[PDB]
Write an enzyme that holds these catalytic residues in place. Structure first.
Site, mmCIF file in Angstrom:
data_model
loop_
_atom_site.group_PDB
_atom_site.id
_atom_site.type_symbol
_atom_site.label_atom_id
_atom_site.label_comp_id
_atom_site.label_asym_id
_atom_site.label_seq_id
_atom_site.Cartn_x
_atom_site.Cartn_y
_atom_site.Cartn_z
ATOM 1 N N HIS A 68 0.840 -1.227 0.000
ATOM 2 C CA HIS A 68 0.000 0.000 0.000
ATOM 3 C C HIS A 68 0.863 1.260 0.000
ATOM 4 O O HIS A 68 0.756 2.102 0.886
ATOM 5 C CB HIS A 68 -0.976 -0.052 1.162
ATOM 6 C CG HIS A 68 -2.117 -0.971 0.926
ATOM 7 N ND1 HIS A 68 -2.177 -2.211 1.521
ATOM 8 C CD2 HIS A 68 -3.237 -0.828 0.164
ATOM 9 C CE1 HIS A 68 -3.308 -2.794 1.161
ATOM 10 N NE2 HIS A 68 -3.987 -1.960 0.335
ATOM 11 N N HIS A 72 1.694 1.590 -5.716
ATOM 12 C CA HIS A 72 0.253 1.243 -5.780
ATOM 13 C C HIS A 72 -0.558 2.461 -6.225
ATOM 14 O O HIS A 72 -1.410 2.320 -7.113
ATOM 15 C CB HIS A 72 -0.235 0.712 -4.440
ATOM 16 C CG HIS A 72 -1.694 0.434 -4.415
ATOM 17 N ND1 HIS A 72 -2.277 -0.532 -5.197
ATOM 18 C CD2 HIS A 72 -2.674 0.923 -3.652
ATOM 19 C CE1 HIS A 72 -3.555 -0.620 -4.915
ATOM 20 N NE2 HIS A 72 -3.832 0.269 -3.988
ATOM 21 N N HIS A 106 -5.942 7.516 -3.120
ATOM 22 C CA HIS A 106 -6.985 6.643 -2.522
ATOM 23 C C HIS A 106 -6.475 5.881 -1.286
ATOM 24 O O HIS A 106 -7.322 5.347 -0.551
ATOM 25 C CB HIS A 106 -7.577 5.719 -3.562
ATOM 26 C CG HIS A 106 -6.762 4.493 -3.782
ATOM 27 N ND1 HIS A 106 -5.645 4.503 -4.557
ATOM 28 C CD2 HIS A 106 -6.923 3.215 -3.354
ATOM 29 C CE1 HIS A 106 -5.112 3.269 -4.566
ATOM 30 N NE2 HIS A 106 -5.864 2.462 -3.835
ATOM 31 N N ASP A 107 -5.170 5.749 -1.080
ATOM 32 C CA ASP A 107 -4.604 4.955 0.051
ATOM 33 C C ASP A 107 -3.557 5.785 0.829
ATOM 34 O O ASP A 107 -2.703 5.205 1.612
ATOM 35 C CB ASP A 107 -3.939 3.684 -0.446
ATOM 36 C CG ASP A 107 -4.824 2.444 -0.554
ATOM 37 O OD1 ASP A 107 -5.830 2.295 0.214
ATOM 38 O OD2 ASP A 107 -4.460 1.592 -1.388
ATOM 39 N N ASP A 217 -8.276 -0.471 -8.365
ATOM 40 C CA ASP A 217 -7.620 -0.869 -7.116
ATOM 41 C C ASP A 217 -7.125 -2.302 -7.227
ATOM 42 O O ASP A 217 -6.141 -2.604 -6.584
ATOM 43 C CB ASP A 217 -8.586 -0.654 -5.958
ATOM 44 C CG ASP A 217 -7.892 -0.637 -4.624
ATOM 45 O OD1 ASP A 217 -6.681 -0.350 -4.573
ATOM 46 O OD2 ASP A 217 -8.554 -0.949 -3.682
ATOM 47 N N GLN A 269 -6.101 -17.530 -3.730
ATOM 48 C CA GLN A 269 -6.110 -16.710 -4.972
ATOM 49 C C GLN A 269 -7.334 -17.075 -5.814
ATOM 50 O O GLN A 269 -8.072 -16.121 -6.191
ATOM 51 C CB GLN A 269 -4.786 -16.843 -5.727
ATOM 52 C CG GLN A 269 -3.628 -16.084 -5.067
ATOM 53 C CD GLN A 269 -3.873 -14.593 -5.084
ATOM 54 O OE1 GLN A 269 -4.183 -13.974 -6.109
ATOM 55 N NE2 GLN A 269 -3.850 -14.022 -3.899
#
Ligand SMILES: Cn1ncc(C(=O)N2CCOCC2)c1C(=O)Nc1cc2nc(-c3ccccc3)nn2cn1
Ligand SMILES: [Mg+2]
Ligand SMILES: [Zn+2]
Length: 313
Positions: A68, A72, A106-107, A217, A269
């Protein structure tokens, strides 16, 4: 004014593709973002000097966590760039401005832990924001940075254009809360199937922008397999640190977060591609047909995770 950003030829061409990887040269990421704003939005959207100062304050407010991080932010913005460029006429001038900025932001100031861990740890942010804890923090950091002197890239907007853009960014950043994604896509599913989806309905637009945000994202799953695979290592490095911290609070973490259950990763996954990614890019392709390459790339990576399970890698 007459000052374009340009990129080397391989980047100039590949940046237009959904599967583009922004590469390991950190010092080029700002130039890549500005390039994308300039082609997506125009050379006139933002005072270059304010934009450059805003980008570098954003970079400084991302931390050196495995996943993060500042890479990213720019990766997620590039995916949005690709959606906006392949769907030219569907979005307003304000939406184009606000969404690349939303994705870059956004993060902001993420610490590499989930909303659950903040709530189990009793972090102050979890008393200030009871749901979408980090995501309300990210929007709040965006406002902070926008109000530093010389950082208001939206200065030239009117008072109400200014409030509409800050409202687009807020909804866009809240929507990256994967807990909200499931219902948001169910509704988008029903509205598209019953033929009631209406892009002049502002609440419908909101949901479609929310789904784009989830798509951007998660865009690690839409890359060439080696990017996808090496990104998944960064993801688990956070998950397992979070799991370790859960154990320090005296809580058995979920398996996703238990480094002692590495063996179960390939199957987790699959769960993820089938429960989240594939449904995400399917509905997105239904609503915005030219985003189909995200769906095709996701299905290819699912098939590479199936091969890993079968011991063919
Ligand atoms: C690939 N990708 N892209 C983005 C994200 C992602 O969740 N985001 C949201 C959180 O923030 C981080 C990013 C992911 C990803 O991998 N999600 C993921 C991995 C996973 N492993 C397991 C698992 C379960 C039992 C045993 C072993 C493993 N369950 N499970 C469920 N989801
Ligand atoms: Mg987030
Ligand atoms: Zn994110």
């Amino acid at each position: 004014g007459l000052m374009q950003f340009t990129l080397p030829v391989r980047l100039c061409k590949e940046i237009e593709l959904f599967h583009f990887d922004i590469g390991p040269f950190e010092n080029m990421w700002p130039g890549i973002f500005v390039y994308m704003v300039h082609r997506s939005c125009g050379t006139s959207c933002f005072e270059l000097e304010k934009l450059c100062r805003f980008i570098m304050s954003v970079k400084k407010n991302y931390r050196r966590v495995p996943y993060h991080n500042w890479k990213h932010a720019v990766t997620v913005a590039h995916c949005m760039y690709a959606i906006l460029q392949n769907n030219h006429t569907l979005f307003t001038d304000l939406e184009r401005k606000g969404l690349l900025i939303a994705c870059l932001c956004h993060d902001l100031d993420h610490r590499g832990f989930s909303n659950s861990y903040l709530q189990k740890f009793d972090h102050p942010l979890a008393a200030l924001y009871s749901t979408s804890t980090m995501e309300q923090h990210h929007f709040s950091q965006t406002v902070s940075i926008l109000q530093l002197e010389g950082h208001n890239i939206f200065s030239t907007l009117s008072s109400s254009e200014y409030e509409q853009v800050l409202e687009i960014i807020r909804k866009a950043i809240i929507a990256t809360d994967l807990a909200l994604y499931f219902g948001n896509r169910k509704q988008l599913e029903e509205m598209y199937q019953t033929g009631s989806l209406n892009l002049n309905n502002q609440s419908h637009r909101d949901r479609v922008i929310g789904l784009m945000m989830t798509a951007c994202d998660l865009c690690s799953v839409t890359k060439l397999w080696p990017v996808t695979k090496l990104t998944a290592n960064d993801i688990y490095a956070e998950f397992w640190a979070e799991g370790d911290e859960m154990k320090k609070l005296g809580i058995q973490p979920i398996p996703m977060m238990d480094r002692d259950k590495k063996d179960e990763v390939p199957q987790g996954q699959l769960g993820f591609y089938n429960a989240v990614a594939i449904p995400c890019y399917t509905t997105l392709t239904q609503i915005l047909p030219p985003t189909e390459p995200l769906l095709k790339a996701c299905r290819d990576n699912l098939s590479q995770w199936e091969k890993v399970i079968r011991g063919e890698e």
